[PDB]
Every structure is written in structure tokens, then in C-alpha cells.
Design a protein around this motif. Structure first.
Motif, PDB file in Angstrom:
ATOM      1  N   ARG A   1      16.615  26.787 -19.116  1.00  0.00           N
ATOM      2  CA  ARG A   1      17.892  26.472 -18.712  1.00  0.00           C
ATOM      3  C   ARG A   1      17.871  25.686 -17.292  1.00  0.00           C
ATOM      4  O   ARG A   1      17.152  26.121 -16.550  1.00  0.00           O
ATOM      5  CB  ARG A   1      18.811  27.789 -18.624  1.00  0.00           C
ATOM      6  N   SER A   2      18.673  24.912 -17.435  1.00  0.00           N
ATOM      7  CA  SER A   2      19.188  24.252 -16.063  1.00  0.00           C
ATOM      8  C   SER A   2      20.639  24.351 -15.847  1.00  0.00           C
ATOM      9  O   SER A   2      21.500  24.307 -16.575  1.00  0.00           O
ATOM     10  CB  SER A   2      18.938  22.604 -16.224  1.00  0.00           C
TER      11      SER A   2
ATOM     12  N   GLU B   1      28.647  22.140  -9.326  1.00  0.00           N
ATOM     13  CA  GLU B   1      29.158  21.000  -8.592  1.00  0.00           C
ATOM     14  C   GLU B   1      28.839  20.553  -7.374  1.00  0.00           C
ATOM     15  O   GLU B   1      29.055  19.312  -6.959  1.00  0.00           O
ATOM     16  CB  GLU B   1      30.855  21.129  -9.036  1.00  0.00           C
TER      17      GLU B   1
ATOM     18  N   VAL C   1      11.972  22.275 -16.309  1.00  0.00           N
ATOM     19  CA  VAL C   1      12.259  22.762 -17.568  1.00  0.00           C
ATOM     20  C   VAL C   1      12.874  21.579 -18.457  1.00  0.00           C
ATOM     21  O   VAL C   1      13.295  20.428 -17.864  1.00  0.00           O
ATOM     22  CB  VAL C   1      13.329  23.786 -17.872  1.00  0.00           C
ATOM     23  N   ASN C   2      13.127  21.809 -19.743  1.00  0.00           N
ATOM     24  CA  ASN C   2      13.795  20.933 -20.692  1.00  0.00           C
ATOM     25  C   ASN C   2      13.472  19.415 -20.998  1.00  0.00           C
ATOM     26  O   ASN C   2      14.089  18.526 -21.090  1.00  0.00           O
ATOM     27  CB  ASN C   2      15.046  20.881 -20.330  1.00  0.00           C
TER      28      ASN C   2
ATOM     29  N   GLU D   1      13.530  22.119   0.087  1.00  0.00           N
ATOM     30  CA  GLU D   1      13.886  22.209  -1.267  1.00  0.00           C
ATOM     31  C   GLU D   1      14.325  20.893  -2.007  1.00  0.00           C
ATOM     32  O   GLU D   1      15.061  20.346  -1.338  1.00  0.00           O
ATOM     33  CB  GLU D   1      15.132  23.553  -1.399  1.00  0.00           C
TER      34      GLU D   1
ATOM     35  N   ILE E   1      12.882  21.686 -10.086  1.00  0.00           N
ATOM     36  CA  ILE E   1      13.367  21.861  -8.698  1.00  0.00           C
ATOM     37  C   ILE E   1      11.930  22.490  -7.808  1.00  0.00           C
ATOM     38  O   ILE E   1      10.851  22.719  -8.717  1.00  0.00           O
ATOM     39  CB  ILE E   1      14.168  23.179  -8.445  1.00  0.00           C
TER      40      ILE E   1
ATOM     41  N   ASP F   1      27.401  22.906 -14.682  1.00  0.00           N
ATOM     42  CA  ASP F   1      27.027  22.716 -16.307  1.00  0.00           C
ATOM     43  C   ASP F   1      25.631  22.933 -16.477  1.00  0.00           C
ATOM     44  O   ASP F   1      24.681  22.786 -15.844  1.00  0.00           O
ATOM     45  CB  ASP F   1      26.795  20.896 -16.324  1.00  0.00           C
TER      46      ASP F   1
ATOM     47  N   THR G   1      16.859  19.012   0.505  1.00  0.00           N
ATOM     48  CA  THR G   1      17.350  19.434   1.888  1.00  0.00           C
ATOM     49  C   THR G   1      16.190  19.937   2.599  1.00  0.00           C
ATOM     50  O   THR G   1      15.234  20.339   2.159  1.00  0.00           O
ATOM     51  CB  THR G   1      18.339  20.563   1.473  1.00  0.00           C
TER      52      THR G   1
ATOM     53  N   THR H   1      23.379  23.140 -13.178  1.00  0.00           N
ATOM     54  CA  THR H   1      23.859  22.113 -12.252  1.00  0.00           C
ATOM     55  C   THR H   1      25.272  22.453 -11.899  1.00  0.00           C
ATOM     56  O   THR H   1      26.166  22.236 -12.459  1.00  0.00           O
ATOM     57  CB  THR H   1      23.755  20.765 -13.018  1.00  0.00           C
TER      58      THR H   1
ATOM     59  N   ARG I   1       9.909  23.726  -4.065  1.00  0.00           N
ATOM     60  CA  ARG I   1      10.166  24.025  -2.436  1.00  0.00           C
ATOM     61  C   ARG I   1       8.643  23.832  -1.849  1.00  0.00           C
ATOM     62  O   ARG I   1       7.830  23.744  -2.408  1.00  0.00           O
ATOM     63  CB  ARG I   1      10.204  25.642  -2.490  1.00  0.00           C
TER      64      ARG I   1
ATOM     65  N   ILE J   1      17.012  26.675 -12.347  1.00  0.00           N
ATOM     66  CA  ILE J   1      16.414  26.675 -13.540  1.00  0.00           C
ATOM     67  C   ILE J   1      16.040  28.151 -14.001  1.00  0.00           C
ATOM     68  O   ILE J   1      15.913  28.742 -12.866  1.00  0.00           O
ATOM     69  CB  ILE J   1      15.048  25.680 -13.643  1.00  0.00           C
TER      70      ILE J   1
ATOM     71  N   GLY K   1      25.854  20.607  -5.697  1.00  0.00           N
ATOM     72  CA  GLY K   1      24.516  20.239  -5.534  1.00  0.00           C
ATOM     73  C   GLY K   1      23.575  21.307  -6.021  1.00  0.00           C
ATOM     74  O   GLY K   1      22.225  21.011  -6.211  1.00  0.00           O
TER      75      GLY K   1
ATOM     76  N   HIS L   1      14.985  30.438 -10.556  1.00  0.00           N
ATOM     77  CA  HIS L   1      14.654  29.423  -9.289  1.00  0.00           C
ATOM     78  C   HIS L   1      15.926  28.782  -9.074  1.00  0.00           C
ATOM     79  O   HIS L   1      16.360  27.953  -9.775  1.00  0.00           O
ATOM     80  CB  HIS L   1      13.428  28.805  -9.614  1.00  0.00           C
ATOM     81  N   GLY L   2      16.580  28.985  -7.770  1.00  0.00           N
ATOM     82  CA  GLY L   2      17.623  27.964  -7.293  1.00  0.00           C
ATOM     83  C   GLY L   2      17.311  27.324  -6.128  1.00  0.00           C
ATOM     84  O   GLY L   2      16.851  27.841  -5.187  1.00  0.00           O
ATOM     85  N   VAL L   3      17.781  26.020  -5.959  1.00  0.00           N
ATOM     86  CA  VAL L   3      17.757  25.171  -4.455  1.00  0.00           C
ATOM     87  C   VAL L   3      18.819  24.413  -4.277  1.00  0.00           C
ATOM     88  O   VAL L   3      19.832  24.564  -5.113  1.00  0.00           O
ATOM     89  CB  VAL L   3      16.523  24.452  -4.720  1.00  0.00           C
ATOM     90  N   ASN L   4      19.130  24.141  -3.191  1.00  0.00           N
ATOM     91  CA  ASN L   4      20.242  23.076  -2.582  1.00  0.00           C
ATOM     92  C   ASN L   4      21.434  23.772  -2.586  1.00  0.00           C
ATOM     93  O   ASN L   4      22.509  22.983  -2.652  1.00  0.00           O
ATOM     94  CB  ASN L   4      20.047  21.910  -3.476  1.00  0.00           C
ATOM     95  N   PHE L   5      21.825  25.184  -2.467  1.00  0.00           N
ATOM     96  CA  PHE L   5      22.628  25.732  -2.397  1.00  0.00           C
ATOM     97  C   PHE L   5      23.461  25.449  -1.056  1.00  0.00           C
ATOM     98  O   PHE L   5      22.828  25.909   0.039  1.00  0.00           O
ATOM     99  CB  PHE L   5      23.077  27.123  -2.712  1.00  0.00           C
TER     100      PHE L   5
ATOM    101  N   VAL M   1      15.868  32.095  -4.934  1.00  0.00           N
ATOM    102  CA  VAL M   1      17.082  31.234  -4.527  1.00  0.00           C
ATOM    103  C   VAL M   1      17.172  30.917  -3.342  1.00  0.00           C
ATOM    104  O   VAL M   1      17.174  31.894  -2.429  1.00  0.00           O
ATOM    105  CB  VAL M   1      18.381  31.916  -5.228  1.00  0.00           C
ATOM    106  N   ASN M   2      17.185  29.759  -2.909  1.00  0.00           N
ATOM    107  CA  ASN M   2      17.285  29.320  -1.408  1.00  0.00           C
ATOM    108  C   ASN M   2      16.149  29.930  -0.682  1.00  0.00           C
ATOM    109  O   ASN M   2      16.609  30.322   0.703  1.00  0.00           O
ATOM    110  CB  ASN M   2      18.408  29.584  -1.138  1.00  0.00           C
TER     111      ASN M   2
ATOM    112  N   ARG N   1      17.178  15.066  -4.946  1.00  0.00           N
ATOM    113  CA  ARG N   1      17.955  15.638  -3.504  1.00  0.00           C
ATOM    114  C   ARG N   1      16.852  16.582  -3.190  1.00  0.00           C
ATOM    115  O   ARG N   1      16.579  17.445  -3.624  1.00  0.00           O
ATOM    116  CB  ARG N   1      19.103  16.020  -4.235  1.00  0.00           C
TER     117      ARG N   1
ATOM    118  N   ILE O   1      21.289  23.650  -7.796  1.00  0.00           N
ATOM    119  CA  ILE O   1      20.582  23.504  -9.100  1.00  0.00           C
ATOM    120  C   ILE O   1      19.686  24.611  -9.363  1.00  0.00           C
ATOM    121  O   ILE O   1      18.884  24.965  -8.393  1.00  0.00           O
ATOM    122  CB  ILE O   1      19.717  22.179  -9.179  1.00  0.00           C
TER     123      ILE O   1
END
Ligand SMILES: O=S([O-])[O-]
Ligand SMILES: O=S([O-])[O-]
Ligand SMILES: O=S([O-])[O-]
Ligand SMILES: O=S([O-])[O-]
Lengths: 220, 222, 220, 219
Positions: free
Chosen positions: B90-91, B95, A120-121, A87, A99, B171, A173, B93, A101, B101, B97, B120-124, B20-21, A171, B99
Motif C-alpha cells: 500500500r501507498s 495532502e 511498493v506497487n 527522508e 520512500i 489517497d 526533507t 499519500t 531514509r 508505504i 506531503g 514506513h512513513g516519511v515527510n510528515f 515513521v519520521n 521530495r 507519504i
């Protein structure tokens, strides 16, 4: 016995959405895992012509293609035949955020890559939506373990038209599919990525990467 | 400028799809709200991917700034975006890592808003509060609205309250785009939010969500 | 128990360096802690005329001057008579970065402020070095405890010429001098800071702030 | 011309971290063209330091980097008149440092006027608890931004217990003399080591090796 062959084929399927624009891209390539070199022919199947810079996609188009020396654990070649997934977040300096994958499996001499990419953005007047990127500069990825997971951070840069740079913090993982895959210690991976050729709209792209793992100074 | 066809009581229809993940999910929403009071409620139902292996809270701001009380002196971009509608990206971020969208394409037919949401979520990290479901709620937040590169943008410094009295920072940056031309851009302003899960079942396969939002100019006139 | 008076005098001494440029600035003011209002006359004693936007310095020129409701713990008024100190990072969207400190004490009816301010990496053509700032927009600071320390985060913005905005992320850490001062729960503080007047080169500046603590919606 | 194969280094640092003031003096030697330097550091004021000495070490001169013939060497070309740098260090737990060095040269000696300020370090963080072991070897990405040479690094501190502590660094480099030619994008590999120290880090011996290069495949 070895899952990793000297010459391997790469099958890739990417689906994505950048700034609300959906796209599908297929890749077919070949590589030398032990030499850390791979090349791939990319074809935009849906969403062409891409309204954004193709370069933002290219690092999403497999750390198994990296020359690992004997004194560093090769997590990636150890993840096969079962495979591994990654990811990634790409944080660009003007607020654009991506992001991605990739789920990587193997059959015979071929890697299979299920890739997703969402961005995005990105501002309308920025280098991405204006397609002012020229290439990624040669980078050095910092590899380390965080919360039991191998992690790679890069201070990346896209060379722009007019010899300016556009910064991206990356980054990744990396997680092996199989339990018990031994984590590597801290190390570096030098990268060099290049679009060798493309048609006018980047509906067809030939892509190349070279990567080498090392321990940094003074070992070099 | 023109009549929005936004009525004081509106219905809300929403389908979210996300990952997510590595975990795919589909969630449906059905709700009601009062756009001019900046209040809305919605019952959410996980259709695929239940039970979610992550904190439901990270999704809740993805589940429409039309539902915000705008005073007469601040331009209301969102109500003026209708009948045609608007979309946002939207993003998020976090604290540690993590992230995310997210996007939403918002349209309106008669008495109902329709929301096509993607998340969509990554790196948790595995032992973080998100994968460990250790979040309690979002604290009340204040979104800063301004025109950035010709696009209305909302920046939030938000916090999730955790079990054990700790906070987990996020954020967020949202870009808002009207579908129709001629929608006047607002000047700098603030939007107070308060979002709340009123009720849920044990696995959060069914969730009742609520939001209250109020736009203002900050001190001393607010 | 407090000894904080409804009408307080403010004595301030800032020294600092931005972009390699050293400066000393004195402040003389009065304020009303319980109304959350204060004003101050600032004079540049060394380093004038400042080659950078004066606005970046203004939040450095005391959360005692904030109206706290009874249902919210007032860390700052409770920190007196012994006083308190804060440290702050200011992260601007173009890479300019500032740190600042203030050691705050009270003698009778006067607050004494020993302030330090350092800023680096401001682009030559950014709005700070080019003095294109107009004012800080009114803001909302997010107050919460991190590692046993009261911390405030702000999504802050400078208004620029042409009504564009220049983003700054502000993190302050607040520490009471006396041990055992009870930490507050999460809450918000609205801020409005303004330069009411100044001479051409900003060698003399009249500054004003209004701040009010609250619980956010639906309460406020 | 200006720079000799062997050079002396004179350094004074004055700073404040977490409200704690300190003055550190430094004396050392280096081979600029080999990109190596050593330095004996002494804490003159503020000892013993209540924080990890490691966070200061990169503040203690890219003149000491092996530049190959195919890359412009902004730093050696900046002498005899010298150059300055400003730096931000953004740690992953919110700790933030800024630092400055005005580098000058008289004779065979470099003179370094260093300032260092750090704020918002968490009391139970690795920095205030002194749990750092060293900086991992790094690679500084060099490029021009708004007419100024700029180096970004994703750096890491190794901690006790084998975990890492991330720091993002940005240095802006500025030649004193006008018209010094800016280099094109390149990389600088770093390795920084505390060779020895007393119990309280009042006295420290410090070593850096650094080599500029063009990245793959030309390195
Ligand atoms: O020879 S490599 O540049 O395709
Ligand atoms: O070879 S030096 O890192 O001891
Ligand atoms: O903004 S002032 O006029 O209260
Ligand atoms: O009405 S309150 O509980 O958000």
C-alpha cells in the motif's frame, strides 16, 4: 578546526525492500565536498540479483557533496561534525512509490550512512521490474523551507531503452542533528548521477555524482 | 472453486514493525472476526517505541480484505486466496506531503490469520496533524477495486477528521496478490469501509480497533 | 420555501475546448430531484464529430438531482431558488487535465445550466483521444467542507476496451449563490452515470444519472 | 531565417479564474536568440483582478529562450508557420489552472492567442488573498512523451512572510507544420519578473529571461 575536509571517505550501509524483495547493499567511496563530486563502489550483500532496476536506488546512495557558492547558505556542510538526516519520497508515474531514509554521521575523514529504502506497487510490466532504465537524466533540485525544514523537490526522469522517459517526482526533507543550524534561502542544486560501471547482474556497481548549487537566472 | 477453510469465526494474529519520521516501533495485535459479515476487532499493544510521537490513526488501515462481506455476484479474491493466503502493498499519500508505504503477508493456520505487517512513513511536517496528534478518526470510505496491470488494485480517496472540524486528505493505493495460482480476478467493484478505534489508553500503547467492510456494485444495485 | 418541483426540466448549454478542439453542446432533459434521477438528450451543435471520448464530458452534463436523507444536510436543494455554481478539476492518470464550471439557476420548473469545459495534455494515443472508453464506473463522491466551501472528491474510473480501467481524480467545489446556506457535515454520494444511447459519432447522446447521498457504513 | 534578432510581441489573453472573467492585452519586444522579452500588459476587462496576477505570468513563448548549438531548437524551427502549447498548473492547495497559446508570426511580430482558466482556489489561499511576491527562478525539464515535446517544472511562488507556494506545471508543445524534428531531453532555466505594476495590476510590465542547457556537467 573544520569538520569538512577536501578529501573524504564514504561508508554506507543500505537495507531495503522493493516489491517484497529484501536486500542489503554496502557502499565504500570517496569524495570532494567542496567540488560536489563523489564516487562509490557498491556491492549487493543480500538479495542479489536484484529483480528490479538498480537506478531507482542510486539517489539514495549526501548533499554535503555539492559545490555551494558564497552567497548561498550551505546547510549541509554546516551540519557537521554532528551530522544530519534526510527522508525522501519517490513517486513514479506508473504508481510505483518509494520512500527512503539516511542518517549521516561523521568520524575523522569518513561519512557514515545508515540508509533504508522501501518501494511498493511497481507493475510487473513496468520499466523498473523489467529493468529497462538506462540512467537518470541531469536534474535540478528546488531547495526551499517548509514548516521549518529544508525541502528539496525534483521533477526527475529516467531515460529508458528506446529513448522514452519515465518520470519520478522526488521530495526530500533535510534535518540537521544540531539545533541552531541556519536554514538557507531558496536556491537550486544541479545534479548529475551516473553508474560508471557494473557487472551483469548489478551485484557490483560503481556510482558517480556531481552537484552544484546556484541561484538560477540571471546570476549564472 | 475450492473450499477456503475460512470459518465464520476466525482469530487474528498480527505483528507490525515500522518507522515513521525516524521513529521505530513494534506493535502486536490479537483479534477475532467474522469474514462473511465483514467485521473484525483487535486489541493492539505497542511493544517498542511507545509512546508513539505520531497519530495512531495513520496505522489503523494497515492493521485484511477477507474481513469484507462479498455478495454472490462479485468475485471474492481474498477468501478464494485461502488456504494459501495473499499479500498486499500500500501507498498512503497525504495532502501535506506525508507519504507512507505498508505491506502485509497474510497466512492462515487453522482458526487463525497471521499478519506480518510493515509500515514506513516519511515527510510528515512537524506542525501537521500527524506529528501533532490532531486526528480524530477516519471517515467511512469507499475503496474502488479493479484489475490494474494484471493485479487487483484498490484506490481510496480517504479523509481523517481533525480536531476543529477540519478534514485531512489521504489517497491510498493497495495492490493485492494471491500466493496460489488459479485465483480468478474480480471485475470492477466497490468496498465500503468503516474503521474505528473503540478505546485506547492515554498514550495509545493499548488500542481496541474495529472494522466493518461491505463489497457492492454501486448504484443502482447496492 | 424550496420551489424545487418533484418533476423538473433541465436546460443546458455547454461550450468548451479539448486538445485545441472547440465545441458547443446543447442538452434538453427532465429529472426528479427527490429521487436523484435525471436524463438528458444532448446534441453537438458545433465541433462535431468530437475527436475525443464523449465520456469525459458526461459528469459536466447538478447535485440537486441526488436523493438526500433527512439526517444529511442538502446544500443543493437549499441553494434554491437563487441557485448555485460549481467548479471542477479532472485529473487523469496519463496527465490529461480538465477544468469545468456550471452556473445553475432556476426559472419556474426548469433548471438552466451554463457549462464550460476545457481539457489539455491528453496523449495522442491515450484512451481519450483514441475513444477507447466505454463508461464511467459507478462511483462514490466524498463530500466535506474545505476553507468554508463544500467540496467533493472522487476516485473515479473509466472502463476501457478489454475491461481495463483509466483513472480520474475529480475535485468539485460547490458554492451557493445565497450567503449563509448551512454547510453539511461529511457524507457520501453514490453516483451511476450512463450513456443510454447515441449515434455513431456521438453527435446525439441520451444521458442518465442516478445519485443517492448517504452516511456510509454502518448506516447505509 | 524566419526569426529576427529583434521581434515584436502582440498578445491577447481571455480567461476565467474562480468564476471571474477577464481580458488582458499585451504589447512587447524581445530578443529570441538572447532568450529575453518584455511586455506591457493591460487588463481591458475584469479589472481589478480579484486574484494574484503572478499565476498568469507564465502564460504571457519558448521561442524566447537561448538555445545552444548542441541542442535542437524546436521552437525557432517551428516558424514561420508557428506552434501551439497547452499547460496545466497544479497548485499545492488544490487550485488548478489550464492554459493555451496559439502562436503565429507575420513579419517581425509574434501573435499570441492565449486562454487561461483556473478553478478550486481556496478563498483564504495566497492566490485569492493576493499574497504572492514572484515566481522563483525555475528549471523546465524538456522531453518527448507520446510524440510530443513536453516540459515539466517544480515551480514555486514566493509569498509574503517568506514561505513558498508550490506549483507543478506541465506544458505540451506542438509545431503547426508537420515533420519538425523533436529535440532530445534537455533543460530550460527560467527567470520571470514583474518589473512594475499599478496598485490594482491593471497595468503590468513583465520580463522573462530563459536559457536552454544540457545540465551538469555541460552547462
Ligand atoms: O569523469 S565522470 O563521468 O566519472
Ligand atoms: O538582471 S534582471 O533579473 O533585473
Ligand atoms: O443500470 S440501469 O439498468 O439501471
Ligand atoms: O458501529 S459504528 O460505530 O462503526
Amino acid at each position: 578546526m573544520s569538520a569538512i575536509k577536501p578529501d573524504m571517505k564514504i561508508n554506507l550501509r543500505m537495507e531495503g525492500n522493493v516489491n517484497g524483495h529484501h536486500f542489503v547493499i554496502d557502499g565504500d567511496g570517496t569524495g570532494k565536498p567542496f567540488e560536489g563530486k563523489q564516487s562509490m563502489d557498491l556491492e549487493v550483500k543480500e538479495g542479489g540479483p536484484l529483480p528490479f532496476a538498480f537506478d531507482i536506488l542510486t539517489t539514495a546512495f549526501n548533499r554535503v557533496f555539492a559545490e555551494y557558492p558564497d552567497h548561498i547558505q550551505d546547510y549541509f556542510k554546516q551540519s557537521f561534525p554532528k551530522g544530519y538526516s534526510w527522508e525522501r519520497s519517490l513517486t513514479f508515474e506508473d504508481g510505483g512509490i518509494c520512500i527512503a531514509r539516511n542518517d549521516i554521521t561523521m568520524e575523522g575523514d569518513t561519512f557514515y550512512n545508515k540508509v533504508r529504502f522501501h518501494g511498493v506497487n511497481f507493475p510487473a510490466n513496468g520499466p523498473v521490474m523489467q529493468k529497462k532504465t538506462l540512467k537518470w537524466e541531469p536534474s535540478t533540485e528546488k531547495m526551499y523551507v517548509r514548516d521549518g525544514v529544508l525541502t528539496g523537490d525534483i521533477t526527475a526522469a529516467l531515460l529508458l531503452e528506446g529513448n522514452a522517459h519515465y518520470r519520478c517526482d522526488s521530495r526530500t526533507t533535510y534535518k540537521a542533528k544540531e539545533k541552531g543550524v541556519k536554514l538557507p534561502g531558496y536556491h537550486l542544486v544541479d545534479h548529475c548521477i551516473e553508474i560508471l560501471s557494473h557487472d551483469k547482474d548489478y551485484n557490483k556497481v560503481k556510482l558517480y555524482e556531481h552537484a552544484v548549487a546556484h541561484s538560477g537566472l540571471p546570476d549564472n
